Design a protein around this ligand. Structure first.
Ligand SMILES: [Fe+3]
Length: 571
């Protein structure tokens, strides 16, 4: 059975259009994967070669994400297509559900060595292979669940929105250079306001030094598992040199080390085992608001200025933008409120009659034990009758804080044995002089709890809380393929047949003549023709000429390295 996509993450899911891959795109995939196989089979984690094949990824052509999804299903994993930049919490949430999110664009031939934007080479060929090791898949899935609970600052949310805006303007024909420059400046302004170390920044550093640039084994002879290294033979070769410091993995070093995506990594972190990473991630998770709860967790929710969920010891989950807290003389929290539409939930399921439409202007809740050391959450029906908490009865009780509640009880919502929500009408709630609830305001819904167990970003029932929009994407128009693309396709068609008859050899010589007359800088198609002739021991004169031309092709250092690496794989 295939891994299911949660309804809340369905809005981020797109479609891979295979017909948008040109013959050059398949050739670029093939060259990179052949180079990746040559070097990584000896220096990468042992799972890389069989893991790529078992993930549905082949060297000859770009992979289909739907095939990868079927291939990973026996491992309890899946693959989905995403279009454009998605929030970090969603990126991690997919992984927490055992789903690999893959952007399907491929890099241009001019950007084989470095792509400014991560492509299918990195997102499929880098992130999928080691998942075939169940210990690694366990770490990535657990990392996904923890990363989806990480709080970001309002400044980080603003910076992310501005970055998403720039990508839409930059990739649009209507946009002017000045319209782009403004979006570029908005990013610098928003990024400048970012300060401090959020849980999300720490999780981002941990993911980078493990899932992305991680090394495993003896520090003297480390093996590569990092997706960025598995997608870059150039970086993987440099990383194993003394030019890059190998440092033992630690949570402290990784969460405290910043990174630059533009330049090669100055240091890399070596783990002994995936079990070590999983244990360290769990130990780190205890510093996070989802595990801590309390005012410390709620403070992170307020700094986010974004939707968050507070879970009480009753199990009542409150989803909204938290805005204010009332603390006592000892700094202990006794009351909290939201300033936004709010929803209430039990067991990640929205309670009936407790949607955003009901709580449109905010939700306020006293938190603590009652007087006489009474935990209202664990109170029995008999104890509630003694307290006066019975439907149709005017209830009057005082919290240990001094918050005073008087109202006619309308409803009691229980979570199993525990009391979770007490609804009131004609209700007045007061703390000293301050009126926390006025009877003119109507219904008071009192969440029951003495402690805040967990604070996490987003919603407990995201499908109910958020609009699950079914976006419509237009199918892209069919590609028009020029002479060069057709020549690449012709070499691929001949290689697939596995026969090199006289007419096929004549076609290859015709292609070599077109390249000599009209395509002086075309090195990849020349390499593919040389590879094919050498494989079938045919066209001896054409092969010698192509080998000499490619060996002495250009003064350019990058292309020379790219050609020489291709020449190195020849029979
Ligand atoms: Fe990556």
């Amino acid at each position: 059975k295939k891994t299911e996509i949660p309804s809340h993450l369905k809005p981020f899911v797109s479609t891979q259009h295979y017909d948008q891959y040109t013959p050059v795109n398949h050739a670029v995939w093939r060259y990179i994967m052949r180079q990746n196989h040559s070097f990584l089979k000896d220096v990468a984690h042992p799972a890389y070669v069989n893991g790529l094949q078992s993930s549905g990824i082949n060297i000859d052509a770009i992979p289909k994400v739907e095939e990868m999804n079927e291939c990973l299903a026996p491992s309890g994993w899946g693959a989905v297509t995403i279009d454009g930049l998605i929030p970090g919490v969603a990126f991690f949430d997919f992984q927490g559900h055992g789903l690999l999110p893959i952007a399907t664009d491929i890099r241009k031939v001019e950007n084989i060595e470095y792509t400014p934007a991560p492509d299918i080479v990195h997102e499929a060929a880098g992130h999928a292979p080691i998942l075939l090791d169940p210990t690694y898949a366990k770490y990535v899935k657990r990392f996904g669940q923890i990363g989806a609970k990480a709080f970001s600052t309002k400044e980080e949310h603003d910076a992310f929105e501005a970055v998403r805006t720039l990508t839409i303007v930059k990739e649009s024909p209507t946009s002017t250079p000045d319209e782009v420059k403004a979006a570029e400046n908005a990013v610098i302004e928003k990024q400048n306001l970012v300060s401090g170390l959020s849980e999300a920044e720490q999780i981002s550093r941990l993911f980078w030094w493990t899932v992305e640039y991680g090394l495993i084994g003896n520090i003297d002879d480390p093996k590569i598992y990092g997706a960025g290294l598995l997608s870059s033979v150039g970086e993987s070769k440099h990383c194993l040199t003394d030019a890059v410091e190998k440092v033992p993995f630690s949570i402290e070093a990784c969460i405290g080390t910043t990174y630059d995506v533009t330049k090669m990594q100055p240091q890399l972190f070596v783990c002994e085992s995936f079990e070590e990473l999983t244990d360290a991630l769990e130990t780190f998770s205890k510093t996070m608001a989802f595990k801590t709860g309390g005012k410390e967790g709620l403070e992170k929710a307020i700094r986010s200025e974004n939707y968050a969920t507070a879970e009480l010891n009753s199990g009542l989950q409150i989803t909204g933008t938290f805005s204010e807290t009332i603390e006592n003389d000892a700094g202990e929290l006794i009351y909290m409120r939201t300033n936004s539409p709010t929803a209430l939930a039990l067991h990640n399921k929205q309670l009936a009659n407790h949607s955003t439409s009901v709580h449109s202007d905010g939700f306020g809740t006293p938190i603590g034990l009652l007087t006489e050391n009474i935990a209202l959450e664990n109170c029995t029906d008999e104890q509630l009758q003694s307290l006066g908490i019975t439907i149709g009865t005017i209830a009057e009780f005082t919290f240990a804080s001094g918050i005073h509640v008087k109202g006619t009880v309308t409803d009691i919502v229980k979570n199993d044995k525990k009391i979770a929500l007490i609804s009131f009408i004609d209700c007045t709630v007061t703390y000293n002089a301050r009126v926390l609830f006025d009877a003119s305001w109507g219904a008071f819904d009192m969440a029951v709890g003495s402690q805040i167990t967990s604070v996490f970003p987003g919603a407990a029932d995201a499908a109910a809380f958020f609009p699950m929009d079914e976006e419509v994407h237009e199918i892209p128009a069919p590609l028009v393929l020029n002479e060069l693309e057709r020549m690449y396709q012709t070499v691929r068609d001949i290689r697939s047949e596995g026969i090199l008859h006289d007419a096929h050899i004549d076609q290859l010589i015709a292609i070599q003549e077109v390249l000599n007359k009209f395509y002086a800088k075309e090195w990849l198609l020349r390499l593919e023709v040389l590879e094919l002739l050498l494989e079938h021991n045919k066209g001896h004169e054409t092969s010698a000429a192509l080998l000499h031309q490619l060996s002495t092709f250009t003064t350019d250092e990058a292309v020379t390295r790219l050609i020489n690496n291709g020449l190195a794989l020849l029979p």
